[model samples]
Structure formats: C-alpha cells, structure tokens
Target: AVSFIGSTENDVGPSLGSYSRLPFVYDTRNKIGYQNANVWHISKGFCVGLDGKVDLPVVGSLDGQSIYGLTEEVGLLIWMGDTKYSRGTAMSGNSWENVFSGWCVGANTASTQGLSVRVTPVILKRNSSRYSVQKTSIGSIRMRPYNGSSAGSVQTTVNFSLNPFTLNDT
Candidate 1:
C-alpha cells in the first residue's frame, strides 16, 4: 500500500469527490488472510484499473443492493479490517477490533463456548486511477473508465514504475 501512495498524486484530483470501498478490491494473492474477492460469480470481464486498484465489481452486475454516502471514516476503517458490523452470525466475528468503542454494539467475545478474539487493523491501501469509478445513470452503465469531467483547467493521467522488494523473513 505504501508503495504507491505518493506515486498517485495529481494536480487535478478526483472528479467525483472522495469515496471509499470496503472489501473494496479483489486481492489475487492467495495468502491466508488476504483472499481474492469472489465477485459472487467472478463475472467474465473483470479486470484492473489504470491505478493500483482492481477494476472489479464493475461492468455487468446488479446493484446487489448498493452503498452510498458511506464514504466516511467508518467506511475507511472497515476496509482497513476494522470491525464495526456483524451479520449476527457466530462466525461474523473477525480479528479487527470492535469499533463502536462502547456504543452498545459490544465486542464479539462469546461465552457459549467462551471464545473471544480481536485483531489489529490491517492497513491495506491503494489509490485508484482508471479504476476510479465513473458516474453513470442506470441506463449509462458500461466500461468507459477513462472519461473525465471537462476541466477547463488542468489534467490527470496514470503512471507506473517497477520497485524492488526487500522481504524480511518471519
């Protein structure tokens, strides 16, 4: 995540204002904690955006019951692996901390079997570009990811660079 932060700055920032996504992207690395988002069906044309984010949950999909106005801190925290919600399932438990911080929705610790768990926020990050979602009326839905507002001012374009990793072992 830190790898691409500064690399994405632009003179003409996001056109649609800031937003967020939780479980926001499809992590293809098959590691234990980072599983790939199973787009419910892995639609045929899923792809990557010009920026570091995945161009998923894109083209040819239902609103599947949608999300909006949630582009705030809680939204950001959820993707960072924070626990602010529960599906009421015993297994709805996650390692991320019980977020509301004493807001009645207490932690997920259980006693029927006396099991309790909490995990620190996993700060995964990505700044998007071509995958930066474009607005479309329900009738305008399509894969046109590169269009920008007519900025009678500045411009923006995506760029990339290869960096070497210095992996420290366990």
Candidate 2:
C-alpha cells in the first residue's frame, strides 16, 4: 500500500483561470477523500469516447461562497500504465510500470466553469497491501453572476482514489 503526502501546481490553459495544488487521500478504510486539497491539471481538450466523459459527485458550496461543487470519481483502468507522467502515483514509489490512472472533477455554482481532469499514471505492486495508493485532482469553472446579481459563481471539483495492491507482495 502507498499514500501521497505533498503539494504540486497545475497549469490551467489560457481559456480557464489558474489553479493551485489540491491534495487527496485514498485508503482501504475510506474509499476516497477529496477535501484535503482543491487544485488540478491534466489538460483541457475534448475526447470522443465513453471513457473520456467527466464523472463526479456534487458536494455543495465552498469557503462560504455560493459555489456549487463536486468531487472527482476514481477507478482503475487497464490503460493507465501507458499514460505515466512526471508527477502522480507512478513517480512516488515502486516502478513506473505498476501505476494506475486516477481521476476526479469539480464545477462551479452553475457548472459552467470547471475543469475535467485525470491524475498522473502510477505504479502499484502486489505487495503493499496494508495501505492503499492515493492520488488527488480538482476542477473549477467560473460563471457570470446569476439574475444580474453582483455575486458570480465558481464551481470547484475535488477527487481522490485508492488502488489496492494485489496482497501477495509480488
């Protein structure tokens, strides 16, 4: 098993606003924990397939503001090994080949302004069974004021996932 403990910055493209570091935790006890941090970076482009759609859970407002938010959903996909990046679970521990891709989402009050994103591919081995591997990602979208009101809407998405080791210590 493994855990993430640190901070990293995500560079949002020109169309969206800048984002900071958002952290999360994944363990056997708790399936997911998205509130630890609130930032994400994976890229902003369209993908044409069922697997590429944004899937998350709506969690409510943030910082006492009128923003409606959601938390990213996580899972283990077979192709995760091929998308390993410099950061994320792949580089944390074990070798690059054993990691899995983790994903999550965040949206503003109206769901108009937020990012759709994925995590750095990571490697999970069969031995680390006691602890589950964890990773974090977030999405945020900004919206215009509602009803011509002065307050604007901002949606933020947070997510994390745990990939359990095979248990045999392979």
Candidate 3:
C-alpha cells in the first residue's frame, strides 16, 4: 500500500542510517557470471511526505555520495530522496587499498501510463521535438569516508557506479 514517495537532505538517512546502503552490484572477472560487489551491506532510507504527486518539486544533485531528492513516477508515483547532502561511512576502510567504489543516480517511471491514449499523444508530441523528458545520466562520485568514527580519518577517495531500476528493460 505504499503511495506518494519523497526524499530529503537526510544524507545519513533517518537517525544514524547510512549513505549508499546498497553501494552497487557488480560482475566478477569471471567470463560469465555475477556476484555481490557490495561488501558492507547497509540500509538506506528516504523521506516520506504528503506533497501529492503534482505539487511536489524534485531536488537533489547526484554528483556526490549523498542521495538527495531523486524523483520520478508513472503518473501514479512521485518518488523522491533525501533533500540535501550529508555524510556516512561505507566506501572507505584502512583494511584495504585501491578499493573500487562506485555510485550512480537517476529516476525511473515503470508504469505504461505513458502509453495510455491520454499520455501517448502528449509524450509523442513532446518526444518529437527537443528532449522534454527530465533525466540525469550515469554519474561518478569520489568521496572520502565523510562520517562515523572514520570521518576525515581515511583520506582516500573512490567512485562507484550502481544499477538503475530499469536494468532489465529494453
């Protein structure tokens, strides 16, 4: 029964939560397979609100480790993330070096609402012209462990790439 979605500037997420709980999924050196690249296995939270689908405006800069107001919907949702930049500890550790960390941000609308007669024409007309759809691309983030007992302690930085919601779609 989940409905209206929202995100905030709550970087560490709700009360001591985390940054990229689920860092990113990856493939191994193996020629044909996959494995869990996310070593820390953390949990993340997004702000919930009553902004209603049409009234809420999206906010967030996915250029860094903080997950902000990342939003999208299928005429049924208006998903969003925390509203501002914050800090956390997940990607950095003295236990290792040259640790490859990646981050990516974007929104995806999953419903076929755009295919409805009501939306089909509007989308077609909009697409026929310049790019009207709002979107961000695969991004890279290099961050130092900016929070926790490790904050500012470990000075190295790493960038991570993540799988978007639409990985299975054509």
| Candidate achieving the largest TM-score | 2
Tell me the lDDT of model 1 at 100.
Answer: 20
Candidate 1's TM-score reads 0.16
- How many pairs of residues collide in model 1? 1
List lDDT for all candidates, in order.
Answer: 0.18, 0.22, 0.18
Query: In terms of lDDT, which candidate is strongest?
Result: 2
Assess every candidate by TM-score.
Answer: 0.16, 0.18, 0.16
lDDT of 2 by residue, 97-150 (tens): 222233322222111112222332112222323322222233222212222222
How many clashing residue pairs are found in candidate 3? Answer: 16
| Model 1: lDDT of residue 68 | 18
Cα-based RMSD of the predictions, in order? 21.6, 18.5, 20.2
- Residue 24 displacement (Å), model 2: 22
Candidate 3, which segments miss by more than 4 Å at Cα?
A: 1-148, 152-170
Better of 1 and 2 by lDDT: 2
Can you rank all candidates by TM-score, best first? 2, 3, 1
Better structure of 1 and 3 per TM-score: 3
Clashes per candidate, residues 3 or more apart or on different chains: 1, 22, 16
lDDT of 1 by residue, 68-153 (tens): 11122111111111111121111121222221211111134211100111111111222413222233111000111122312132
